[PDB]
Design a protein around this ligand. Sequence first.
Ligand SMILES: COc1ccc(CC(=O)O)cc1-c1cccs1
Ligand SMILES: [Zn+2]
Ligand SMILES: [Zn+2]
Length: 585
Amino acid sequence: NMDVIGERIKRIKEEHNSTWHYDDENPYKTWAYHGSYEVKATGSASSMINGVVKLLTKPWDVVPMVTQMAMTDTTPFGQQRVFKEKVDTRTPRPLPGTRKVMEITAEWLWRTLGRNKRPRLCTREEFTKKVRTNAADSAKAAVEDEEFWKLVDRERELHKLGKCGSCVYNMSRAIWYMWLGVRYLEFEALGFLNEDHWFSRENSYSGVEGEGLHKLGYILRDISKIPGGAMYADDTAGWDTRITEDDLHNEEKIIQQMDPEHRQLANAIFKLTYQNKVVKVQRPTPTGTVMDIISRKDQRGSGQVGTYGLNTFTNMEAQLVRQMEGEGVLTKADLENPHLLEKKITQWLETKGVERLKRMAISGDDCVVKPIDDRFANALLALNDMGKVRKDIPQWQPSKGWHDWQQVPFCSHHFHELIMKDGRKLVVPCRPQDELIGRARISQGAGWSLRETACLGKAYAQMWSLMYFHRRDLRLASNAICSAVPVHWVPTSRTTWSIHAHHQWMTTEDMLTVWNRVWIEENPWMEDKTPVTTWENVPYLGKREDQWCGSLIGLTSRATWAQNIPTAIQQVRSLIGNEEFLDYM
Ligand SMILES: COc1ccc(CC(=O)O)cc1-c1cccs1
Ligand SMILES: [Zn+2]
Ligand SMILES: [Zn+2]
């Protein structure tokens, strides 16, 4: 294994020759440990609070979920704690019959996904334009430096020789350039999956990439129209740690559809940075903080470019395999059998595969499946054997599905169908309100001015106006924040890193105009394009549903906050200064 990872370790060991040592009391059990060197401690035990959002959400000062979200440890202690809990495990190898079905399904799936699209390399200019349309940060300075691109070229020459010298995953500027260079090279070889939307619903059938949060509920409602059993949405316990060496070899099959120059670079990413990997992790010791150099041959590196797409692929594959078991196509004897009959698997894929993909909504490890009947509930042999063990449920207990798409959890949300005053229906995203408020009350980092803090607050308020307008407390709090923040100040930073976020709230355009564009004009499930001319006509959840989903409506502390909110708005206004504000209440 040193033949692939040795050069990377040699360069780390040489760079840190001063403090390099082999800590014999290292905590790694399933990862190969190579050594340690001293570093400064990174991260914090708590998260900085957004004073603007906090001052305009007083009733949630006394809310347990809101307090918990403000915590979140990122220090070397936090890193070690999380590592021990999930990351330091071994997934048992799937049985020979399971490996055979997975291989047949993977080959068929890749051919289906590549029926109209051809893979291609992504470029320096694509990467640059992406870094630029994210910040104005140090990555934008690196991308603007020609010396960064020369290091990239030197690493690619090693990759073409089947070698790696600096692509290390992290759990002066030379180490930063090497990290960003590693990410660019991965982007160059596998970025086409995201850039060319291989996991769009049109291209993948099950996928939802590029759809956006506001379309997910409509997609779940369309799946509900398909004849069959209940809708199942089982959570896998730490999906990324369950990606096996067999999953990685099935994912690699996409290289067969690539041009030879692309294939060579993609093969280098697969073989040297996915199927073999070198990881840096901080650890507190009595003498200070150390960086550990570890390695392994499986699992998914969570921060990588290919993660989302490759998790989506393997989950689509795994769910088709589970659907086959439910239908009686795969038996317990088949999974144990190395010599299992390939014909019935092929016949099912070529005659039913696409129809079976249409019964699903898959986003990374998140899945919703509507099988042809409920035999699926108890079809767990292949799912557990592939290593995709469901979270917090005995291994052999049947899955519980839903007969109402509105109760189905998907991508941290559930979705409600609303009837507008004019009779039109909307399908809206929703989650426990405390999670929305709790997140909005967290600022990103330290040394942020009241201006930057107020602008992130505005970003959260405007996201609420567009996605969560149907929640009484969030429309009220959103109006309060937008009233306290100067009208012409542009929302800054980002409310989420979610692939489902299209950030339509990152503007100074009127939120009702933006609402109309998203929910009426551009909405393909809105046949009648009549615009909504007033927020008074923008609906809310039924009062009982709003309360079931965490609303404080009907409580006195809430009635008091609603009554006294102009006072809190004015307090924020007086501390911001003599700017142009607008009254939204
Ligand atoms: C599926 O969409 C999500 C899932 C999770 C989260 C939470 C977070 O990332 O902080 C946010 C979102 C979105 C908010 C607005 C548009 S997407
Ligand atoms: Zn490399
Ligand atoms: Zn809800």
